[PDB]
Design a binder for this molecule. Sequence first.
Ligand SMILES: [Cl-]
Lengths: 214, 204
Amino acid sequence: SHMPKLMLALDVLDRDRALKIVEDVKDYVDAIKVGYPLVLSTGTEIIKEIKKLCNKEVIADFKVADIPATNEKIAKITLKYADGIIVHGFVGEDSVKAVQDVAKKLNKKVIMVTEMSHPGAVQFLQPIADKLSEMAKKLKVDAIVAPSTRPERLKEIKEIAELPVITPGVGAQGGKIEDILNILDENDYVIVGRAIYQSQNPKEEAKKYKEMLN
Amino acid sequence: GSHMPKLMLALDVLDRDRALKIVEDVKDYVDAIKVGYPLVLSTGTEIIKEIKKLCNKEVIADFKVADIPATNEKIAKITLKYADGIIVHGFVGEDSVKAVQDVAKKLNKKVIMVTEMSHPGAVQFLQPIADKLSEMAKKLKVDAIVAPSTRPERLKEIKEIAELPVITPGDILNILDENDYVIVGRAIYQSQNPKEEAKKYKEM
Ligand SMILES: [Cl-]
């Protein structure tokens, strides 16, 4: 009923491997997220190819973080084949708007990083985490990316942004994260990565993680 | 220092053929070429290999790296296979910068940190911590910083805090020395005669 969507973080370097996994998991995942390490090797052709294959939403996790003019150019090339793009809010409103303006014309999505979970985030990013979710709400982006390391914190984030959230659905070991599925709904996404893509049988893993969402 | 800064071309074009033509034309008058994602995303890092091959000068990847350490490391490895240096954000934290540095150090290649930006959006979150980012750059001993030249006095303040080389857009020269780079873009790449324009800027 109110089960979140399953987003695969397809963090492999080899395009053949990436394509094999996509074909294998397409019936169980709702979205595929690709980043620069995969895309940088051969360019955006891989996003196009992933799209010839699965007919599911493809999100480019490119952490866009430049001036408006450059953000616009990155957005245009990226959203040619991707369905959505992930941007930083820390570079300011105008930079985010530049990406949104491109996405709107294409009926595609802009997703803002409001909060991160690596240790270094504590210094400058975390102090403004609420300011970022407020800006995501103001600009009406399509979704935000934020951590699930603290369920109570995830609830606070959703309540400020009032937007779909994309968040990890499993911990560092690949096990279920407790007490977040009751916070999320059918417009949110949970991310699973290595626990699927490092398997020799990614289909069975994707099936397992999809069923985990009840 | 009191010698002339280096000249960096911001090669902000989309087309592969044009990029390569410009590079060949200007190679003898620029000290470095900066490439960004809009150019690289079309065909991937092969274009950096071909550019580096043609100019045999410093190639900097302006990728504004801004992720967690593990992802930053991966981007650094792929980028620095052909590029000589990479531009990273300091805002996402020390560990994220250090991940790129650790890759670069093994390759004798450069890490350059954005400490300050000049678009209107920079005011909101970046500018209030600009001094702290310069201090971070100093602490981490990155190779250079990227900062604006809108106010020469401010550029001087940044240099005094970081005590690092700066890469800054092209009165500004009095603040710069032989370790710094002036960035020039459209004036060169959009010229009818890029070689001529590059030579002229190099003479300034
Ligand atoms: Cl995982």
